[PDB]
Structure formats: structure tokens, C-alpha cells
Design a protein around this ligand. Sequence first.
Ligand code: XNS
Ligand code: NI
Length: 158
Amino acid sequence: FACKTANGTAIPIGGGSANVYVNLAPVVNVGQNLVVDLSTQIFCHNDYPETITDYVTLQRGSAYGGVLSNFSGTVKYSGSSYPFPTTSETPRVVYNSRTDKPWPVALYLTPVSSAGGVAIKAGSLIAVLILRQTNNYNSDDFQFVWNIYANNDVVVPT
Ligand SMILES: COC(=O)CCCCCCCCO[C@H]1O[C@H](CO)[C@@H](O)[C@H](O)[C@@H]1O
Ligand code: NI
């Protein structure tokens, strides 16, 4: 089991960390969502699907910077929704193929009332999503840590 990003880097077998940049709508109002869909960017695969089944959860989601300070959030993981920042590890998703399959995670972020002006700075860390991977074969239990960075400023119209 390993993962890689759409158009950049990889986390190899055994886990590790990687930095991911996301495009964000440049203007969002109170009551509207920024949708950050990571399933078009993070892809994982099972390296031995014939003998091993891999299990993948969103172990934890954390907010940082302007997201932590200026937005309220939910996370969608494989068809279900949760508070973001998360309050516990999610059910698991099965990886059973050598073909790349998306990691099905998306954030829905909505500005809080106190947000106004540049609520998220270009280049700043906005979230960390931890992918935890185990299997039905041995005691492997690995973390794939995705630091999510804002590509651009996001403005909440005052
Ligand atoms: C009875 O013999 C076997 O079951 C050997 C099966 C082929 C060798 C498998 C060696 C271990 C491969 O491990 C990697 O690939 C596995 C499958 O993706 C992951 O579950 C592991 O965590 C790790 O990422
Ligand atoms: Ni591989």
C-alpha cells in the first residue's frame, strides 16, 4: 500500500508525510461553502490485492491558520459526513486493487461571522488529514500524513 498525489509526490510503503496544495475559490460569503475535494489529488493502491486486503480510514482531520480561525467545517469521507476538525477515526474503506483509486475525502468550509478580508492566506497551512492504513495479513499499521496548503488567498466579503 502506498499513495501519491495527482501531479506531484508520493508517500511510499510504510507511510510518511507529504505536502499538498489546493485551489480555493477566491471569494466566499457567510453561508456559502468552500469545497476542498482531495479525491482528485490523493490516490492510493494495494500492492498485493490477491492475498492482502488493505483498510483505509481518515484517522483525524485538523484545521490550521485561517481555516481554524475563520471557518466552520465538515468532512465527507467515502459517502458519510463528519465534523471538521474530526472527533474520531472514521469507518474504513477497502483498497483491493493495484489500480490507483482516489482517497475519498472532501472538506466543506463555511466562514464564521467574524471572518472578513483575507480569511486564508496564499501558501499557508490550512489542514492536516491523516490516512491510517492497516490490512488483513500482518500487524502493519501506518500513517500517511497530508499537509494541505492554500494555493491562493481567500476573501470573505465584508
Ligand atoms: C503467504 O504469503 C503471502 O501472503 C505473501 C504475499 C506477497 C508479499 C506481501 C509482503 C508485504 C507487502 O506489504 C505492503 O503491501 C501490502 C498490501 O498493499 C500492505 O498491506 C502492507 O502494509 C505493505 O504496504
Ligand atoms: Ni505499488
